Design a protein around this nucleic acid. Sequence first.
RNA 1: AAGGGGACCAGCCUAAACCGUCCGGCUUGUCCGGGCGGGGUCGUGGGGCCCUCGGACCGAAUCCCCAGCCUAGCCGAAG
Length: 74
Amino acid sequence: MKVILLEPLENLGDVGQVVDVKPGYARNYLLPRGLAVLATESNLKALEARIRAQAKRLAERKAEAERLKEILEN
RNA sequence: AAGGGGACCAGCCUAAACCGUCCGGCUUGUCCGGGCGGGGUCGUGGGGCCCUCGGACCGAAUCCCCAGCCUAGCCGAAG
Ligand SMILES: [Mg+2]
Ligand SMILES: [Mg+2]
Ligand SMILES: [Mg+2]
Ligand SMILES: [Mg+2]
Ligand SMILES: [Mg+2]
Ligand SMILES: [Mg+2]
Ligand SMILES: [Mg+2]
Ligand SMILES: [Mg+2]
Ligand SMILES: [Mg+2]
Ligand SMILES: [Mg+2]
Ligand SMILES: [Mg+2]
């Protein structure tokens, strides 16, 4: 069963990473402890959108700086 | 059972793509989800979306009116 981790987790994977676990583990541990979510299409979309949104605001800052290197350094 | 002879005869509505709107969620949007509306309905495959060209007839199984019909009757030849 594929899940999306909601947290870093000892020798399983890192937050936002998609891993394969035995359904028992997902259903009766990971999901109830809020540690992961089902890799459904409907929330794979959402993860894609989060990676999307973070990467927008990262490079947007790495411009607000780079462009501020232009106003200074000259 | 197919086929043949007959009876009767009639075909439609959706889901999904996509568009719009309301509402809810937290992991804040190019988000996910629920409702509603739009769109769509097919096997020569059909639809969606993006270009190009083109721009009144049919019509209910719903509704309304009516004929007809039922629920009482009546006239009815000549010792
Ligand atoms: Mg057989
Ligand atoms: Mg027959
Ligand atoms: Mg026949
Ligand atoms: Mg008959
Ligand atoms: Mg929805
Ligand atoms: Mg929506
Ligand atoms: Mg909706
Ligand atoms: Mg086609
Ligand atoms: Mg009809
Ligand atoms: Mg009499
Ligand atoms: Mg008499």
